From Swiss-Prot:
Name this protein carries in UniProt: Leaf-branch compost cutinase
Record family assignment: Belongs to the AB hydrolase superfamily.
Cellular-component GO terms for this entry: extracellular region
Practical use: The engineered enzyme with mutations Ile-209/Cys-204/Cys-249/Gly-93 can hydrolyze PET in a highly efficient way, ultimately achieving, in less than 10 hours, a minimum of 90 per cent PET depolymerization into monomers, with a productivity of 16.7 grams of terephthalate per liter per hour. It was also shown that biologically recycled PET produced from enzymatically depolymerized PET waste exhibits the same properties as petrochemical PET, before being processed into bottles, thereby contributing towards the concept of a circular PET economy.
Purpose: Catalyzes the hydrolysis of cutin, a polyester that forms the structure of plant cuticle. Shows esterase activity towards p-nitrophenol-linked aliphatic esters (pNP-aliphatic esters), with a preference for short-chain substrates (C4 substrate at most). Cannot hydrolyze olive oil. Is also able to degrade poly(ethylene terephthalate), the most abundant polyester plastic in the world. Can also depolymerize poly(epsilon-caprolactone) (PCL), a synthetic aliphatic biodegradable polyester.
Organism: Unknown prokaryotic organism
Pfam families documented for this protein: PETase (PF12740)
Other remarks in the entry: The gene encoding this enzyme comes from a leaf-branch compost metagenome. The source organism remains to be identified. However, it is presumably a thermophilic bacterium.
TM stretches of this protein: none
Temperature dependence: Optimum temperature is 50 degrees Celsius with pNP-butanoate as substrate. Optimum temperature using PET as substrate is superior to 70 degrees Celsius. Shows 70% of the maximal activity at 30 and 70 degrees Celsius with pNP-butyrate as substrate. Has half-lives of 5 hours at 50 degrees Celsius, 80 minutes at 60 degrees Celsius, 40 minutes at 70 degrees Celsius and 7 minutes at 80 degrees Celsius. Is thermostable, with a determined melting temperature (Tm) of 84.7 degrees Celsius.
Post-translational modification: The disulfide bond between Cys-241 and Cys-258 contributes not only to the thermodynamic stability but also to the kinetic stability of the enzyme.
Length: 259
C-alpha cells in the first residue's frame, strides 16, 4: 500500500467487466445551478472515507448524460468521482464540448457538493467522451496538460491533429458509419505526438453506439487507462500490455505505458 492513490484489490479481467469494489450513488446537477455547461450527473463512491481521482465525461451530438450512465456508474464503482455533463445545447460541437468539460472540471474542484469533494482528490483529474464528446476530450487535452488521461470513445472531430502529453487511449468501433475509424479514431491516434503514451483499440463488429450500453472491452480499457494514469496504479498495465484480446480487430500503441 506504498502508492497512496491505489484503490481496491488486485484486478482480474472478469472483475473489470462488472461494477467494482465501491458502492456508488449519484448527484444530479441542475442546468440552472451552474454556468459553462448544462449540469449532469456525478457518480461517486459511498461506504468509504477514501478519496479518488475525478473524471469529466461528455456525451455526443444530440445525446445527454444518460447515454453514458452505465459507464459513469461502472467507472465510479471501480474508485472514481465521475461527472457526466449535459451540454448547454444537444447541438453543441466538439470544441464547445471541450469548453463544457473545462467548466465541469472547474466545478468538480471548486463548487461541487461537500459529499463529492470529500470523496475527491481534485489534483487527479481525467476526461473521456463519446463521439463529439471524444473530439472535446482531445481539444481539452491539448489545452490542459495537468489532465492525467484522456479516453475518446468512437470519437468525431474535423480537427485531426492534437498536441498533448496527456496519455490518450482511443476506442474505435470497426463498423462505425457515423465516425468511421479511417477518418476519425485512427488519424487522431496517428497525428498524436510520437512521445505521448497512446493506445488505439478497435472493437470487432461494433457500431458507433457501442459506448452507449454496457461493453466488456470499453469497461476493461477505460478502467485500466484511468487506473494506470489517474492513480499511477501499475497493477492495470497487465490489461494494456501484451494484449491478446479476441474482442479487438485492431490494436496500436507506441508502448510508453508498460514501464
Ligand atoms: Ca448551465
Ligand atoms: Ca489541430
Ligand atoms: Na481545462
Amino acid at each position: 500500500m506504498s502508492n497512496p492513490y491505489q484503490r481496491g484489490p488486485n484486478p482480474t479481467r472478469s472483475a473489470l467487466t462488472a461494477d467494482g469494489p465501491f458502492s456508488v450513488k449519484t448527484y444530479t446537477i441542475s442546468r440552472l445551478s451552474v454556468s459553462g455547461f448544462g449540469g449532469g450527473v456525478i457518480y461517486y463512491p459511498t461506504g468509504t472515507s477514501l478519496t479518488f481521482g475525478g473524471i469529466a465525461m461528455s456525451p455526443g451530438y444530440t445525446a445527454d448524460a444518460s447515454s453514458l450512465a452505465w459507464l459513469g456508474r461502472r467507472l465510479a464503482s471501480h474508485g472514481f468521482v465521475v461527472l457526466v455533463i449535459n451540454t448547454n445545447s444537444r447541438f453543441d460541437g466538439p470544441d464547445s464540448r471541450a469548453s463544457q468539460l473545462s467548466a465541469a472540471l472547474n466545478y468538480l474542484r471548486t463548487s461541487s457538493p461537500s459529499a463529492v469533494r470529500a470523496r475527491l482528490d481534485a489534483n487527479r483529474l481525467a476526461v473521456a467522451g463519446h463521439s463529439m464528446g471524444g473530439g472535446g476530450t482531445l481539444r481539452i487535452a491539448e489545452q490542459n496538460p495537468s489532465l492525467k488521461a484522456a479516453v475518446p470513445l468512437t470519437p468525431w472531430h474535423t480537427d485531426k491533429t492534437f498536441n498533448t502529453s496527456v496519455p490518450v487511449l482511443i476506442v474505435g468501433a470497426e463498423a462505425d458509419t457515423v465516425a468511421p475509424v479511417s477518418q476519425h479514431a485512427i488519424p487522431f491516434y496517428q497525428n498524436l505526438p510520437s512521445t505521448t503514451p497512446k493506445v488505439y483499440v478497435e472493437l470487432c463488429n461494433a457500431s458507433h453506439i457501442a459506448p452507449n450500453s454496457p461493453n466488456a472491452a470499453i469497461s476493461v480499457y477505460t478502467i485500466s487507462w484511468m487506473k494506470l494514469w489517474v492513480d499511477n496504479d501499475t497493477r492495470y498495465r497487465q490489461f494494456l500490455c501484451n494484449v491478446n484480446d479476441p474482442a479487438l480487430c485492431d490494436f496500436r500503441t507506441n508502448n510508453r505505458h508498460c514501464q
